[PDB]
Amino acid sequence: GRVRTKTVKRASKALIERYYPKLTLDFQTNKRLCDEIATIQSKRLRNKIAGYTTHLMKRIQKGPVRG
Amino acid sequence: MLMPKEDRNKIHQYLFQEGVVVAKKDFNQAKHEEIDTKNLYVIKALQSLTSKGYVKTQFSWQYYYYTLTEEGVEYLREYLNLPXXXXXXXXXXXXX
Amino acid sequence: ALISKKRKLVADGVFYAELNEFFTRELAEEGYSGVEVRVTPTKTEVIIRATRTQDVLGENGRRINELTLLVQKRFKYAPGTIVLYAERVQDRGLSAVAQAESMKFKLLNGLAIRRAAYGVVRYVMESGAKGCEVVVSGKLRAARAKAMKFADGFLIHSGQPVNDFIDTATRHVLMRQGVLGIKVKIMRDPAKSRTGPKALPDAVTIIEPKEEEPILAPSVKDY
Amino acid sequence: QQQQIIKIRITLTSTKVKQLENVSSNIVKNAEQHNLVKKGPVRLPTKVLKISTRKTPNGEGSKTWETYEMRIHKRYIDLEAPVQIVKRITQITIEPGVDVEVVVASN
RNA sequence: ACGGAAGGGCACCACCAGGAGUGGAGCCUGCGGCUUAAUUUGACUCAACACGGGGAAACUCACCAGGUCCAGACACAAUAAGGAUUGACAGAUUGAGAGCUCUUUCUUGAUUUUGUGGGUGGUGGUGCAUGGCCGUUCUUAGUUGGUGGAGUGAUUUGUCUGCUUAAUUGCGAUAACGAACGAGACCUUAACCUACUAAAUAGUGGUGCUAGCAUUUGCUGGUUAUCCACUUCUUAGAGGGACUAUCGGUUUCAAGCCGAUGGAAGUUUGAGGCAAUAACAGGUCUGUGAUGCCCUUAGACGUUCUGGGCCGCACGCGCGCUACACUGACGGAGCCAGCGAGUCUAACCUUGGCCGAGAGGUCUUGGUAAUCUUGUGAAACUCCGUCGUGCUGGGGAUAGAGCAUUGUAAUUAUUGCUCUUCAACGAGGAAUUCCUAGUAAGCGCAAGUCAUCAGCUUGCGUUGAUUACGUCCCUGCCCUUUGUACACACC
Questions:
Q1: Which pairs count as long-range contacts for C15-18, CB under 8 Å and 24+ apart, including other chains?
Q2: Where in the cell is it found (chain A)?
Q3: From A13, which residue of chain C is nearest by alpha-carbon distance?
Q4: 3 state SS of D7
Q5: Which nucleotide's C1' sits nearest to the alpha carbon of C7?
């Protein structure tokens, strides 16, 4: 069950919302960005958020998404 | 309890002096640390002293912790025929 | 001595347990709240944390003497190999044990269960605590047993932050009728913490950007 | 004029890894604060003391076993050092909970 | 809240497909039944019965036959310094070298005695008076509040038809919008780190040194200091790493799931720890000096001592252990783990050398431990033979005799050893438990218990399949819809 939790998708939401002059479609740069931008008390969590904000990122780059 | 007044002397002297007693819940122990009597003698003499409100009694982990009280000092005084303002652990010892 | 450090550490632990026990029993009327044992050169330092150190000291240092003599005599220590200090606990309303013994001593004064509990939780909140809940189990004035939860604020119950934030005390108030169980819970503010993880593994805070004024063709600046 | 080259092995041992490592690296760096000869903090395999119990006070119920574990951590550091600097390294670097022991040893 | 009402789901404590079995056999072991001076007791569907850490020779111990002691605080009163009161040699006696009792008569010195009141102790009662703890619902996903909408209202909406996940997990529809508890996060561990810090308690390379075979240069060992060097293996600190990634199928191009690639690892990475609100007259006063009340308290239901008993056997049931053999027994030989654990005011873990068929003994030793036992040279297992389907050399119950060890004590045989005795059991009725990958099952250790006693247990590693990768047929459980005259809620 790889269904990302609510705080994850909510966080990815806020990120892509207020930091599109940054990020890309690469998990690495997104993750490192995530560290130099948000205080995520966990590596695993931050990487969850980064991977998902990455999927949302690559999915806005073909046609926008709700929220 | 039934004990010779000699061991009563050992006990009451020891308490009036050291101001504090300790004794494990273990009868049949022949003899006690510091005091020269059968452990029982101490425990029961202390039940006596503690019921008439002269000492304070506590337990925890199989050990009778005996505090002394102020009327207890009055009565250790009375029982050891020594003047008012005698001894007890009411002195600053060395400098500790 | 000449022990296996397994048994040394274990024995150290059991020593602590018996210690906190004895102090708890002996210093209830003084709002005792825990100890720590310190192995140093020359002496070994037991440090008390009651709320009433002016009385724990005793008549010009007579009672702390009684207790030091006690511990000494019991655990077999040479007169000076052990010393007991008694320094007050900062914010008595953040260590569970203190509030536990508190409400207990409230109900030994016959105050309304609701009144005592609600006043306890109110105090705990007012002492800048993230949350607090006091469960009261047992039989009381009635016949069949009952229980009462009293929560206020924020607490979590699951995971590692259990060990990190919340304090859980369980004190058995004994009355003429039967007995009651005073369970006390205090969630202390993560933001403070001083030492250790200062925010919940949940809390992911995003920082807010700033307006930028682009336009106006490039140019450069020579220093 | 005291001061003579003694071989030493100070062993730290405790259950709180943060303070143990604290006093460990503090010791190694405060002893290397002055070019002293040494074999730095050697880590002994972490000891795990287990206790396997029944959760129940009595007998009834599913057979739920609860497992407890406490952890011993032992470091040992070797220093080649005189007499003063040793009493100096023993007086300070004291930690409430960390068991420190200072052995001469050379045969 | 409940239903012998309707519709969906969930699940190896459910099916399916198979696996290994259990149920039949001997024995071990618990429960019942009986027996008994006593055969102490709680627990009886899942959620009682290899459970109370319950492997009882004494003790434990609660039971039975018996003998002691008070360890009955304290207050009042009473007795009494012409003596209130304790002890005892011997004997009578008694299981007993108990002055328990008595014979006789020394001693002791206000410690006690008697009496009342009051205490105290109690594995005595009440878990249906309670604390606490635990088990079960639950191998579950539920609880709540702010602004707002509907209602006089208690309340409702949020918190929902669908879809998707292990998840009130998401997506999505949408009078709701955004949230907190719980799930998730987190923790802990097993997986990766020729990247960092290092280590005669870990280990490698080189060399001093030396043995063997080669002798051409070698190959194979020794040398807890002969130095030098390294940190890949080992150890543990700090960091890295995965976020179901990349590509691509399928689906309201949504959550997601499916496949190939890559990767230490892509079933919540594998396995655990914690874990909401609420419920039960679940269990536990036989863990507690946690406790209310009741009962007992000197011919004790207090404790202690001797002896016995929980093991008593026509039979019912449960967890099991060893088997019926030829993918085997026997016998030589090959030989590899991982989790542990160990002695101070002591005899714990024991290498080595001899004595012995064996069990064991005896003399030394290392080790408070990564340093010694120990590389725990474990067992299954692999290899060479013997036996050859014959209740056989499979099987080892039953039983006689002899040596040893634990322990004050081994008879009703604690355990271990050798000789002989050579049962039932020829794959097992209806029935029924567990299980989806290093899993099942086979194999053995360590640890708990422990003086001596594992056929139990908690972990650990060793060899390593078959069959799903689904469903709602049996079962159990959730969810709505529905009824209700229940609400201490179908007991």
A1: C15/C75, C18/B60, C18/B61
A2: Cytoplasm
A3: C206
A4: strand
A5: E368
Give the distance, in angstroms, between residue A2 CA and nucleotide E156 C1': 35
Which tokens hold the place of B52?
A: 């008439």
**How many residues in total does chain C contain?**
223
- Of the candidates C190, C131, C128, the one whose C-alpha atom is nearest the C-alpha of residue C164 is C190
**8 Å CB contact of A39 and C205:** yes
Resolution in A: 3.3
Please say whether the beta carbons of B69 and B56 come within 8 A: yes
E strand map for C17-81: 35-39, 44-48
C89: nearest Cα among C34, C51, C36, C46: C51
Say yes or no for a CB contact (<8 Å) between C206 and A14: yes
Q: Are C138 and C178 in contact (CB under 8 A)?
A: yes
Query: Beta-strand (E) ranges in C21-165?
Result: 35-39, 44-48, 82-86, 131-138, 146-153
- Distance between CA atoms of B39 and B42, rounded to whole angstroms? 5
Give which of A18, A13, A45, A47 is closest to A30, Cα–Cα. Answer: A47
* Inter-chain touch C6–D49, beta carbons under 8 Å: yes
Residue B24: Cβ-neighbour burial (10 angstroms; 0-12, 13-18, 19+): middle
**What span, in angstroms and rounded, lies between the C-alpha atoms of C55 and C61?**
9
Beta carbons of C38 and D96 less than 8 Å apart: yes
Question: Measured between CA atoms, how close is C86 to chain B, in angstroms?
Answer: 15
Domain ranges of chain A: 6-61
Structure determined via: X-ray
Q: Tell me, in Å, how far CA of C197 is from C1' of E339?
A: 33
Which residues have CB under 8 Å from C172's CB, separation 6+? C179, C180, C181, C182
Is B15 buried (19+), middle (13-18) or exposed (0-12) by CB count in 10 A?
A: buried
Could you give the C-alpha distances from C198 to C90, C188, C202, C207, D46, in angstroms and in order?
A: 19, 11, 11, 17, 28
Q: Is B72 on the interface with C (CB under 8 A)?
A: no
CATH code linked to domain A6-61: 1.10.60.20
Q: Any chain C CB within 8 A of the CB of D49? A: yes
Q: Which of B90, B93, B95 to mutate to test the interface with C (most CBs of C within 10 A)?
A: B90
